[PDB]
């Protein structure tokens, strides 16, 4: 990272970007390398702007009379700026200084005086991964990562004690304002800090089970709510109790209905079941409406995908950078799942062109039928929602490529018997492209039950021997030993696949915490709601339908004293339990 | 059945009602060590049964429709068109395959049948093997002893039951029915533990398990004194 | 009962060591061990919200453990007398 201070010295060197002389390092040089060390966040962390431009200070640039970078707000210009000190944090800036010099013990000590003590623990661990990610090549990257783990462990412990006392106060402490490290209130930090430990710990996914299940309740399962979709008059009865109904705030049917509408659980099933009925519509437009003319039902299949790609556009433009079009698009392209969704669109286009040509109606009959199967795998990507469902689809993340491997394992091994079965027996069923049927099609069907025994039957003992010989290689080796290749893989990475699903479950939660309450039938109204809003407000700064928690200084003070009390309390107990490890009582 | 125009509904509803009594029987037949704890196991699957229903059955759909999509089939009538498109699909999984009927579009038919059955017979069956072995080995130290707990319920029920068979249990019913008209109180018999213990014979005991208590706690602190880490810190 | 009422008094003030000591003079020494553990679960069931409900439940477990041990020794000697001791009036 010292070599990175050299590179950032030459990232904005003396002549081109910092026009005066500048071979000596500064503090906005550190700020602009913290720019790349952490994400695309609000990074005050310093007085970066031109009031304290710490980038060009070696030639006598005059005072504030320029204000292009002139820095004389505090005192006179003497190749310095004056007492324009930390302005945000003394000690956790020392925490950055301890970890950038590979001083682990000093950083541990000065953590005990840090103001943050939670988000510092996540952010520093992320920076430690950044140091191991960039270049260490031995002897420190492993221990940078491991010591990042033990800072995350202290984050586990401080949450453990603070969630125990005033869990409601703790859960609102997980939401800070854009003041200390700007935004990323110790939750979006956990995103790029790779914390499948911290987010999968006690009250995290419990509070995430509070934003999911946004306001109404958490106890009821999927048994009596599924009756609440269809029975419209039923919510007025005492079947389920709202949080409004918990205090009996239900006096308005509009409130009882719209608070129900805005719940991410309800937005989920409204987008899921209406789209699920759209698959039924896509099946019906091909089962009965397989006609070469646009009927009353054929025209309905046109713009449903158009009604959903605008939601994908909203995902593309909700809070990205204002410059990046193939920069944020790489994030979409970074996942092969997104390319599978792209393939779902392109196969529809491929069958659309075949349907547009009347001479290729059979290709239009088959291509869309194959395109049907891509939407259900995309559904399992979306339907990765339940504890009995989610982690076990994180498991199939290990088989999607292993699926293909066992394809050309089992299917190619099918060939070594499909040809050999018809080799000896005299078969005469053949025609153009049905000769393949009587030699290959009547071979795999024999594996799973359809055996022409009265047709496939001196060459009888050999037929019995070969059928006994070959099925031992499939139904025993490639199935029953595949049982062994599955049980251990389930038991080895389960302590990953469960908590990493606790990690990725949040993505759906932000998406439905970044979604309006309109169903896809009516989601075009919400599309046009922003379409008519961009012609009168040409800026993406109208609403941040997100965490957006506002916290006052004074009420945060009555907290800050408390988790610093809890921090030194917990570290006293932590060194106490460390003092309880008997091997010190061996060496004492 | 009371409505003669709905005899077929009376033919089918009671037939479905037959299946509820046997599951109730397995609730009652949770009696043996090779039987009981493993029905305490199915206490973990009754809802997991439903989860694997709409897992496996809905995944049946992604191939039941796709199988008849390419091959030209013409077997249809009112409510039997469903048969030739759906009924002849799940039956192919377990052995009944109209291979002489379902059979240029032959290589694709082989490919798709090889493609899809790997997702069921391997993932949803053989990985379900993994979802079962560990669940058996993780909660066994619960499911055995909690069955030792719930086995008592049947024991009180048959320690709260007369000796008359259900053919003759109406006689025992009327035994209390004619007893409530001459004794209008539920304090006749407590067919239960109801152990009477005298004060004096209980005295010859009480001294003994107090002797045993201080004896045992002396031995318990003795074995605690045998934990070597005290001999580390002493 | 003098002493096992003191046992209730020790556990209702979250005094675990004192209750363990005064168990050694309790007349019950079996049903007290079960009943107190149940009361301890009641305390954890109603409201503790941290730092004692887990250890109320765990210390209820070790009282149940002493119940395991006292049964272990009393069943060993005069198992027929033990089995009739499981039935009190």
CSV table of C-alpha atoms in Angstrom, one decimal, chain A residues 155-501:
chain,number,residue,atom,x,y,z
A,155,UNK,CA,-18.1,-7.1,15.1
A,156,UNK,CA,-20.0,-10.3,15.8
A,157,UNK,CA,-19.4,-9.9,19.6
A,158,UNK,CA,-20.3,-6.2,19.8
A,159,UNK,CA,-23.5,-6.9,17.9
A,160,UNK,CA,-24.0,-9.9,20.3
A,161,UNK,CA,-24.0,-7.7,23.4
A,162,UNK,CA,-25.8,-4.7,21.8
A,163,UNK,CA,-28.6,-6.9,20.3
A,164,UNK,CA,-29.1,-8.5,23.7
A,165,UNK,CA,-29.8,-5.2,25.5
A,166,UNK,CA,-32.4,-3.0,23.7
A,167,UNK,CA,-32.7,-5.1,20.5
A,168,UNK,CA,-35.1,-2.4,19.1
A,169,UNK,CA,-32.4,0.2,19.8
A,170,UNK,CA,-29.8,-2.0,18.3
A,171,UNK,CA,-31.9,-2.5,15.1
A,172,UNK,CA,-32.2,1.2,14.7
A,173,UNK,CA,-28.5,1.5,15.4
A,174,UNK,CA,-27.9,-0.6,12.3
A,175,UNK,CA,-29.2,2.5,10.4
A,176,UNK,CA,-26.9,5.5,10.7
A,177,UNK,CA,-27.0,8.8,8.7
A,178,UNK,CA,-24.5,9.8,6.0
A,179,UNK,CA,-22.1,11.5,8.4
A,180,UNK,CA,-19.2,9.3,9.6
A,181,UNK,CA,-18.2,7.4,6.4
A,182,UNK,CA,-21.0,9.0,4.6
A,183,UNK,CA,-23.7,6.4,3.7
A,184,UNK,CA,-23.4,2.6,3.9
A,185,UNK,CA,-24.7,2.4,7.4
A,186,UNK,CA,-22.9,-0.9,8.4
A,187,UNK,CA,-25.3,-2.9,6.2
A,188,UNK,CA,-24.2,-1.9,2.6
A,189,UNK,CA,-20.7,-2.0,4.0
A,190,UNK,CA,-21.3,-5.7,4.8
A,191,UNK,CA,-22.2,-6.2,1.1
A,192,UNK,CA,-18.7,-5.6,-0.3
A,193,UNK,CA,-17.1,-6.5,3.0
A,194,UNK,CA,-18.2,-10.2,2.4
A,195,UNK,CA,-19.8,-10.8,5.7
A,196,UNK,CA,-21.7,-14.1,5.5
A,197,UNK,CA,-20.7,-14.4,9.1
A,198,UNK,CA,-22.1,-11.0,10.3
A,199,UNK,CA,-25.4,-10.9,8.3
A,200,UNK,CA,-26.1,-14.6,9.3
A,201,UNK,CA,-26.0,-13.9,13.0
A,202,UNK,CA,-28.9,-13.6,15.4
A,203,UNK,CA,-30.9,-10.5,14.8
A,204,UNK,CA,-29.6,-9.4,11.4
A,205,UNK,CA,-31.9,-11.6,9.3
A,206,UNK,CA,-34.5,-11.0,12.1
A,207,UNK,CA,-34.5,-7.3,11.3
A,208,UNK,CA,-34.3,-8.4,7.6
A,209,UNK,CA,-37.4,-10.5,8.5
A,210,UNK,CA,-38.8,-7.1,9.6
A,211,UNK,CA,-38.1,-5.2,6.4
A,212,UNK,CA,-39.3,-8.3,4.6
A,213,UNK,CA,-42.7,-8.7,6.3
A,214,UNK,CA,-42.3,-5.0,6.2
A,215,UNK,CA,-44.9,-3.7,8.7
A,216,UNK,CA,-47.8,-6.1,9.1
A,217,UNK,CA,-46.6,-9.1,11.1
A,218,UNK,CA,-44.0,-11.9,11.1
A,219,UNK,CA,-45.7,-14.9,12.8
A,220,UNK,CA,-48.1,-16.2,10.2
A,221,UNK,CA,-46.8,-18.6,7.5
A,222,UNK,CA,-48.0,-19.2,4.0
A,223,UNK,CA,-51.2,-21.1,4.9
A,224,UNK,CA,-53.8,-18.5,5.7
A,225,UNK,CA,-52.3,-15.6,3.7
A,226,UNK,CA,-52.7,-17.6,0.5
A,227,UNK,CA,-56.5,-17.4,1.3
A,228,UNK,CA,-56.0,-13.6,1.7
A,229,UNK,CA,-55.2,-13.1,-2.0
A,230,UNK,CA,-58.6,-14.3,-3.3
A,231,UNK,CA,-61.0,-13.7,-0.4
A,232,UNK,CA,-61.2,-9.9,-0.8
A,233,UNK,CA,-63.7,-9.3,2.1
A,234,UNK,CA,-61.7,-11.5,4.5
A,235,UNK,CA,-59.1,-9.1,5.8
A,236,UNK,CA,-61.8,-7.2,7.6
A,237,UNK,CA,-62.3,-10.2,9.9
A,238,UNK,CA,-60.1,-11.4,12.7
A,239,UNK,CA,-58.1,-13.9,10.6
A,240,UNK,CA,-54.8,-12.0,10.6
A,241,UNK,CA,-53.7,-9.1,12.8
A,242,UNK,CA,-51.9,-6.1,11.3
A,243,UNK,CA,-49.4,-4.0,13.3
A,244,UNK,CA,-52.1,-1.4,12.7
A,245,UNK,CA,-54.5,-3.9,14.1
A,246,UNK,CA,-52.1,-4.6,16.9
A,247,UNK,CA,-52.8,-1.1,18.2
A,248,UNK,CA,-56.3,-1.3,16.5
A,249,UNK,CA,-55.2,1.5,14.1
A,250,UNK,CA,-57.4,-0.2,11.4
A,251,UNK,CA,-60.2,2.3,11.0
A,252,UNK,CA,-59.7,3.0,7.4
A,253,UNK,CA,-60.2,0.4,4.6
A,254,UNK,CA,-57.9,2.4,2.4
A,255,UNK,CA,-55.1,2.2,5.1
A,256,UNK,CA,-55.8,-1.5,5.7
A,257,UNK,CA,-55.5,-2.2,2.0
A,258,UNK,CA,-52.6,0.1,1.0
A,259,UNK,CA,-50.4,-0.8,3.9
A,260,UNK,CA,-51.1,-4.3,2.8
A,261,UNK,CA,-50.1,-3.3,-0.7
A,262,UNK,CA,-46.8,-1.7,0.2
A,263,UNK,CA,-45.6,-4.7,2.2
A,264,UNK,CA,-42.7,-6.4,0.3
A,265,UNK,CA,-44.3,-9.8,1.0
A,266,UNK,CA,-47.4,-8.8,-0.9
A,267,UNK,CA,-45.5,-7.1,-3.7
A,268,UNK,CA,-43.6,-10.4,-4.0
A,269,UNK,CA,-46.7,-12.6,-4.6
A,270,UNK,CA,-48.4,-9.9,-6.8
A,271,UNK,CA,-45.4,-9.9,-9.1
A,272,UNK,CA,-45.0,-13.7,-8.8
A,273,UNK,CA,-48.6,-15.0,-9.3
A,274,UNK,CA,-49.5,-12.5,-12.0
A,275,UNK,CA,-46.4,-13.4,-13.9
A,276,UNK,CA,-47.2,-17.1,-13.2
A,277,UNK,CA,-50.6,-16.5,-14.8
A,278,UNK,CA,-48.6,-14.9,-17.6
A,279,UNK,CA,-46.9,-18.3,-18.2
A,280,UNK,CA,-50.4,-19.8,-18.3
A,281,UNK,CA,-51.3,-17.2,-20.8
A,282,UNK,CA,-48.2,-18.0,-22.9
A,283,UNK,CA,-49.2,-21.7,-22.8
A,284,UNK,CA,-52.8,-20.9,-23.8
A,285,UNK,CA,-51.7,-18.7,-26.7
A,286,UNK,CA,-49.9,-21.7,-28.1
A,287,UNK,CA,-52.3,-24.5,-27.1
A,288,UNK,CA,-55.6,-23.1,-28.4
A,289,UNK,CA,-54.4,-19.9,-30.1
A,290,UNK,CA,-51.8,-21.6,-32.3
A,291,UNK,CA,-53.1,-19.5,-35.2
A,292,UNK,CA,-51.4,-17.4,-37.9
A,293,UNK,CA,-53.6,-14.4,-37.2
A,294,UNK,CA,-53.7,-11.9,-34.3
A,295,UNK,CA,-56.8,-12.8,-32.3
A,296,UNK,CA,-58.3,-11.3,-29.2
A,297,UNK,CA,-55.9,-13.5,-27.1
A,298,UNK,CA,-52.9,-13.5,-29.5
A,299,UNK,CA,-52.4,-9.7,-29.1
A,300,UNK,CA,-52.2,-10.0,-25.3
A,301,UNK,CA,-48.8,-11.8,-25.5
A,302,UNK,CA,-47.2,-8.8,-27.1
A,303,UNK,CA,-46.3,-6.2,-24.4
A,304,UNK,CA,-46.2,-8.1,-21.2
A,305,UNK,CA,-42.4,-8.5,-21.6
A,306,UNK,CA,-42.4,-4.8,-22.5
A,307,UNK,CA,-44.2,-4.1,-19.2
A,308,UNK,CA,-41.4,-6.0,-17.4
A,309,UNK,CA,-38.3,-4.7,-19.2
A,310,UNK,CA,-39.2,-1.2,-18.0
A,311,UNK,CA,-38.8,-2.6,-14.5
A,312,UNK,CA,-35.4,-3.9,-15.6
A,313,UNK,CA,-34.8,-0.4,-16.9
A,314,UNK,CA,-35.7,0.9,-13.4
A,315,UNK,CA,-33.1,-1.5,-12.0
A,316,UNK,CA,-30.7,-0.2,-14.6
A,317,UNK,CA,-31.5,3.4,-13.6
A,318,UNK,CA,-32.4,3.7,-9.9
A,319,UNK,CA,-29.2,4.8,-8.2
A,320,UNK,CA,-26.3,4.0,-10.5
A,321,UNK,CA,-23.6,6.4,-11.6
A,322,UNK,CA,-24.7,9.0,-14.1
A,323,UNK,CA,-21.9,8.3,-16.6
A,324,UNK,CA,-21.7,4.5,-16.8
A,325,UNK,CA,-23.7,2.6,-19.5
A,326,UNK,CA,-21.3,-0.3,-20.3
A,327,UNK,CA,-19.8,0.2,-16.7
A,328,UNK,CA,-22.9,-0.9,-14.7
A,329,UNK,CA,-23.9,-3.2,-17.6
A,330,UNK,CA,-20.8,-5.3,-16.8
A,331,UNK,CA,-22.4,-5.9,-13.4
A,332,UNK,CA,-25.4,-7.4,-15.2
A,333,UNK,CA,-23.0,-9.4,-17.5
A,334,UNK,CA,-20.9,-10.6,-14.5
A,335,UNK,CA,-23.5,-13.2,-13.8
A,336,UNK,CA,-24.4,-16.0,-16.2
A,337,UNK,CA,-27.9,-16.0,-14.7
A,338,UNK,CA,-28.5,-12.6,-16.3
A,339,UNK,CA,-27.2,-14.0,-19.6
A,340,UNK,CA,-29.8,-16.8,-19.1
A,341,UNK,CA,-32.5,-14.1,-18.9
A,342,UNK,CA,-31.0,-12.6,-22.0
A,343,UNK,CA,-31.3,-16.0,-23.7
A,344,UNK,CA,-34.9,-16.1,-22.6
A,345,UNK,CA,-35.5,-12.9,-24.5
A,346,UNK,CA,-33.5,-13.9,-27.6
A,347,UNK,CA,-35.2,-17.2,-28.0
A,348,UNK,CA,-38.5,-15.4,-28.0
A,349,UNK,CA,-37.1,-13.1,-30.8
A,350,UNK,CA,-35.7,-16.2,-32.7
A,351,UNK,CA,-39.2,-17.7,-32.6
A,352,UNK,CA,-40.8,-14.4,-33.5
A,353,UNK,CA,-38.8,-14.2,-36.7
A,354,UNK,CA,-39.8,-17.8,-37.5
A,355,UNK,CA,-43.4,-16.9,-36.8
A,356,UNK,CA,-43.2,-13.8,-38.9
A,357,UNK,CA,-42.3,-16.1,-41.8
A,358,UNK,CA,-45.5,-18.2,-42.6
A,359,UNK,CA,-43.4,-20.9,-44.1
A,360,UNK,CA,-41.7,-21.6,-40.8
A,361,UNK,CA,-44.8,-22.1,-38.5
A,362,UNK,CA,-43.4,-25.4,-37.2
A,363,UNK,CA,-40.2,-23.6,-36.1
A,364,UNK,CA,-42.5,-21.1,-34.5
A,365,UNK,CA,-44.3,-24.0,-32.9
A,366,UNK,CA,-41.1,-25.4,-31.3
A,367,UNK,CA,-38.9,-22.5,-30.5
A,368,UNK,CA,-41.4,-20.8,-28.2
A,369,UNK,CA,-42.1,-24.2,-26.6
A,370,UNK,CA,-38.4,-24.5,-25.7
A,371,UNK,CA,-38.4,-20.8,-24.6
A,372,UNK,CA,-41.0,-21.8,-22.0
A,373,UNK,CA,-38.4,-23.9,-20.1
A,374,UNK,CA,-36.1,-20.9,-19.6
A,375,UNK,CA,-38.7,-18.9,-17.6
A,376,UNK,CA,-39.2,-21.7,-15.0
A,377,UNK,CA,-35.4,-22.0,-14.4
A,378,UNK,CA,-35.5,-18.2,-14.0
A,379,UNK,CA,-38.3,-18.7,-11.6
A,380,UNK,CA,-36.2,-21.1,-9.5
A,381,UNK,CA,-33.7,-18.3,-9.5
A,382,UNK,CA,-36.4,-16.0,-8.1
A,383,UNK,CA,-38.1,-18.7,-6.0
A,384,UNK,CA,-35.0,-19.2,-4.0
A,385,UNK,CA,-36.9,-17.7,-1.0
A,386,UNK,CA,-37.5,-20.4,1.7
A,387,UNK,CA,-35.2,-22.1,4.2
A,388,UNK,CA,-36.2,-25.5,2.9
A,389,UNK,CA,-35.9,-24.1,-0.7
A,390,UNK,CA,-33.2,-21.3,-0.7
A,391,UNK,CA,-30.1,-23.0,0.6
A,392,UNK,CA,-30.8,-26.1,-1.5
A,393,UNK,CA,-30.9,-23.9,-4.6
A,394,UNK,CA,-27.6,-22.5,-3.4
A,395,UNK,CA,-26.7,-26.2,-3.6
A,396,UNK,CA,-27.7,-26.5,-7.2
A,397,UNK,CA,-25.4,-23.5,-7.8
A,398,UNK,CA,-22.7,-26.3,-7.4
A,399,UNK,CA,-24.5,-28.6,-10.0
A,400,UNK,CA,-25.5,-26.3,-12.8
A,401,UNK,CA,-22.1,-27.0,-14.4
A,402,UNK,CA,-22.0,-30.4,-12.8
A,403,UNK,CA,-25.4,-31.0,-14.5
A,404,UNK,CA,-23.6,-30.6,-17.8
A,405,UNK,CA,-20.7,-32.9,-16.7
A,406,UNK,CA,-23.2,-35.6,-15.8
A,407,UNK,CA,-24.9,-35.1,-19.1
A,408,UNK,CA,-22.0,-35.9,-21.3
A,409,UNK,CA,-21.0,-38.6,-18.7
A,410,UNK,CA,-24.3,-40.5,-18.6
A,411,UNK,CA,-25.6,-39.7,-22.1
A,412,UNK,CA,-22.3,-40.6,-23.8
A,413,UNK,CA,-22.2,-43.8,-21.8
A,414,UNK,CA,-25.8,-44.4,-23.0
A,415,UNK,CA,-24.2,-44.7,-26.5
A,416,UNK,CA,-22.0,-47.6,-25.6
A,417,UNK,CA,-25.1,-49.7,-25.1
A,418,UNK,CA,-27.6,-48.1,-27.5
A,419,UNK,CA,-25.5,-49.1,-30.5
A,420,UNK,CA,-24.6,-52.5,-29.0
A,421,UNK,CA,-28.2,-53.5,-28.3
A,422,UNK,CA,-29.3,-53.4,-31.9
A,423,UNK,CA,-26.0,-54.8,-33.2
A,424,UNK,CA,-26.9,-58.5,-32.8
A,425,UNK,CA,-30.7,-58.7,-33.0
A,426,UNK,CA,-32.1,-58.4,-36.5
A,427,UNK,CA,-34.1,-55.2,-36.7
A,428,UNK,CA,-35.8,-53.9,-39.8
A,429,UNK,CA,-37.7,-50.8,-38.7
A,430,UNK,CA,-36.3,-47.9,-40.7
A,431,UNK,CA,-37.2,-44.9,-42.8
A,432,UNK,CA,-35.8,-41.4,-43.4
A,433,UNK,CA,-35.0,-40.0,-39.9
A,434,UNK,CA,-37.0,-42.8,-38.3
A,435,UNK,CA,-34.2,-45.3,-38.8
A,436,UNK,CA,-32.6,-43.3,-36.0
A,437,UNK,CA,-35.8,-44.1,-33.9
A,438,UNK,CA,-35.5,-47.8,-34.1
A,439,UNK,CA,-31.8,-47.8,-33.2
A,440,UNK,CA,-31.5,-45.0,-30.7
A,441,UNK,CA,-35.0,-43.9,-29.5
A,442,UNK,CA,-35.9,-47.5,-28.6
A,443,UNK,CA,-32.7,-47.7,-26.5
A,444,UNK,CA,-33.0,-44.9,-23.9
A,445,UNK,CA,-36.7,-45.7,-23.5
A,446,UNK,CA,-35.8,-49.2,-22.4
A,447,UNK,CA,-33.8,-47.8,-19.5
A,448,UNK,CA,-36.9,-46.2,-17.8
A,449,UNK,CA,-39.6,-48.7,-18.6
A,450,UNK,CA,-40.5,-48.8,-22.3
A,451,UNK,CA,-38.8,-52.0,-23.5
A,452,UNK,CA,-40.0,-53.7,-26.8
A,453,UNK,CA,-39.3,-57.1,-25.2
A,454,UNK,CA,-41.4,-58.9,-27.8
A,455,UNK,CA,-39.3,-57.2,-30.5
A,456,UNK,CA,-35.8,-57.1,-29.1
A,457,UNK,CA,-36.0,-60.8,-28.3
A,458,UNK,CA,-29.9,-68.4,-30.3
A,459,UNK,CA,-28.7,-64.8,-29.4
A,460,UNK,CA,-30.8,-64.8,-26.2
A,461,UNK,CA,-28.3,-65.8,-23.6
A,462,UNK,CA,-26.0,-63.0,-24.8
A,463,UNK,CA,-28.9,-60.6,-24.8
A,464,UNK,CA,-29.5,-61.4,-21.1
A,465,UNK,CA,-25.8,-61.2,-20.3
A,466,UNK,CA,-25.3,-57.8,-21.9
A,467,UNK,CA,-28.4,-56.3,-20.3
A,468,UNK,CA,-27.3,-57.6,-16.9
A,469,UNK,CA,-23.7,-56.4,-17.6
A,470,UNK,CA,-24.4,-52.8,-18.6
A,471,UNK,CA,-27.1,-51.8,-16.2
A,472,UNK,CA,-24.8,-52.6,-13.3
A,473,UNK,CA,-22.6,-49.8,-14.6
A,474,UNK,CA,-25.4,-47.2,-14.7
A,475,UNK,CA,-27.8,-48.0,-11.9
A,476,UNK,CA,-25.0,-48.9,-9.5
A,477,UNK,CA,-21.9,-46.8,-10.4
A,478,UNK,CA,-23.4,-43.7,-12.0
A,479,UNK,CA,-26.4,-43.5,-9.7
A,480,UNK,CA,-25.6,-45.2,-6.4
A,481,UNK,CA,-22.0,-43.8,-6.3
A,482,UNK,CA,-23.5,-40.5,-7.4
A,483,UNK,CA,-25.3,-40.9,-4.1
A,484,UNK,CA,-21.9,-40.7,-2.4
A,485,UNK,CA,-20.8,-37.8,-4.6
A,486,UNK,CA,-23.9,-36.0,-3.2
A,487,UNK,CA,-24.1,-36.7,0.5
A,488,UNK,CA,-20.6,-35.5,1.3
A,489,UNK,CA,-21.0,-32.4,-0.9
A,490,UNK,CA,-24.1,-31.6,1.0
A,491,UNK,CA,-22.4,-32.1,4.4
A,492,UNK,CA,-19.2,-30.2,3.5
A,493,UNK,CA,-20.4,-26.8,2.2
A,494,UNK,CA,-23.6,-26.6,4.2
A,495,UNK,CA,-21.9,-24.3,6.7
A,496,UNK,CA,-21.4,-22.2,3.7
A,497,UNK,CA,-24.6,-22.6,1.6
A,498,UNK,CA,-26.9,-21.8,4.5
A,499,UNK,CA,-25.2,-18.5,5.5
A,500,UNK,CA,-24.3,-17.4,2.0
A,501,UNK,CA,-28.0,-17.8,1.3
